[PDB]
Amino acid sequence: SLAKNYEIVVVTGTNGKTLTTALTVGILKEVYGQVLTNPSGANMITGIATTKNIAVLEIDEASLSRICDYIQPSLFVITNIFRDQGEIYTTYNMILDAIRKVPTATVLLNGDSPLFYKPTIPNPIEYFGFDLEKGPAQLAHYNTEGILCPDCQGILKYEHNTYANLGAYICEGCGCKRPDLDYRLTKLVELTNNRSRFVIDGQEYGIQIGGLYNIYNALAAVAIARFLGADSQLIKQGFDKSRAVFGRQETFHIGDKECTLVLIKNPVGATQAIEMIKLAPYPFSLSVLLNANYADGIDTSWIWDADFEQITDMDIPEINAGGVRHSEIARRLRVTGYPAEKITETSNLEQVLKTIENQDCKHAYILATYTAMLEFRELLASR
């Protein structure tokens, strides 16, 4: 009850599947023309999507095992596995159990994660990573999760660290370290608050969004095309056509001001946004809108693990502390050591819009949780 007339690539992981998959398609269309994929998300009811040439499927961690009874993929790709609100190692071993069923497949993993290190599967493993200049080993920031060597059980250090627990890891007891990378991002060329340009296996690609976590999505896409023997020149040709999937920056002219609106979900995501806006070449007003609900995370405690302490080193004159949980976020912002006098706790979103409207500074960043952003996206005045 299926068509196996297809070399088939499956793409799983906790974060960034749709992008990686959508990007991988656009690239491969410039090589094979017709590339078969599935829209949005998909579990076992992907036969509808399926009804010489190549297919790339976004699969859910859970559903994978089932399917791998039916289809017989050539490439498994795991972008990365992080936890949300002992749950990482079970969903890794869930995907790893599916992959046992298809011993002919190659597995393409994010080499930079320690979680992927000598997987207990017979399949041949291939790794992509940021192969950047190694400095002397340094620990990661103490709130970084998953830093135990997968052999020694001791604490890992980083010859260089991209973000989270990713980079050139090394245990100074076991000796365990990041394995040799098969698809290498060799140089981080540019990286601002708005763009990043980078070199992978000879070619420069760039994305018009910024924030460093997204580069790992591009890398995975490029690494897949390379596994399928695509010319680095054609990879770029189609990369560019399909780079829309990262999306533009969502900036708003508020009369005389230019305010940019940025989503925060979790500590790692928030920190990532903070390290992004740190790179802006101008002064700005920082507004942080914290709501608490299903979509935004029911417990606001997560902001205490986000590295807001970096704002003190930025060029920020005004801060606004808005959203339903305005009171908790203002306290968080204070505890950075940012001038308490300049943090303006703000009951109402209308008042935040106005204090920005009437600020003297010219640019304004607004970091907000999902719903806080939807509410604020009601600028039913002018957008």
Binding site: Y142, N143, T144, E309, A330
Partner: protein, 247 residues
């Protein structure tokens, strides 16, 4: 190797606090390492230059060097790795505790100061045993919810959110951090929550506990300062320095 995770900028600070962030590397979950950031902040407002050291795996705890010791909650796996390391730190931490050293322990931290704790599966895991309490098994069920307690010795009320499988049972020589007003707290009996030994402050409160309860932040840091610099010292008033953080 111990390392300095945080420190105050240089400035005119009468006092000097040294904070041991026990296993800050591994016990870092559910926002509870925000408690380190609250001590630092409060201590600076009472004229202390803070120096937070991560004393973690394979390291030694210098019982004579530190003034506050914080011990957060972590993931199950990480916590059982820590459990194996602990006997090296038992004599040190016991001396620290018994010489009236200030401690704030939370969730897994709190559990691990005691005799043992039993994982949800039923695995017994030995703790330091520098304290008398134990924590028992609860298969397929959690004490999740809002919670409010009252410590009759300080006439102080602490609020938080709790979410734990284990059921802690204090010993005869321990008082709880407070009596429950609503919520579960330590165990099925819904009487007591946390612990209060002698400058040890245990709890299962998320929040983190010191953000939500500035009054406990103030107590911990002043209790530490007065122990080091003598009870007679005069510190800025609770309402004067932490006015913005008071409901």
């Amino acid at each position: 190797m111990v390392y300095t995770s945080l420190s105050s900028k240089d400035g005119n600070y009468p006092y000097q606090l040294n904070i041991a962030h026990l296993y800050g590397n591994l016990m870092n979950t559910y926002g509870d390492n925000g408690n380190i950031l609250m001590l630092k902040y409060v201590a600076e407002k009472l004229g202390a230059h803070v120096t937070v050291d991560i004393v973690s795996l394979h390291d030694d705890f210098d019982e004579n060097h530190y003034d506050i010791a914080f011990f957060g909650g972590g993931q199950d796996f990480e916590q059982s790795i820590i459990a194996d390391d602990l006997p090296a730190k038992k004599e040190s931490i016991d001396n620290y505790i018994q010489n009236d050293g200030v401690v704030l322990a939370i969730c897994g931290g709190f559990q691990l100061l005691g005799q043992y704790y039993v994982e949800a599966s039923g695995k017994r895991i030995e703790g330091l045993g520098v304290m008398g309490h134990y924590t028992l098994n609860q298969t397929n069920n959690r004490f999740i919810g809002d919670i409010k307690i009252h410590n009759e010795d300080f006439d102080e009320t602490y609020y938080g959110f709790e979410n734990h499988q284990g059921r802690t049972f204090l010993s005869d020589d321990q008082k709880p951090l407070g009596q429950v007003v609503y919520g579960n707290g330590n165990n099925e009996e819904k009487v007591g929550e946390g612990v209060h030994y002698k400058n040890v402050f245990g709890s299962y409160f998320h929040g983190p506990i010191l953000s939500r309860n500035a009054n406990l932040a103030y107590r911990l840091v002043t209790t530490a300062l007065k122990k080091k610099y003598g009870q007679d010292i005069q510190l800025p008033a609770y309402e004067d320095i932490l006015s913005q953080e008071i409901a």
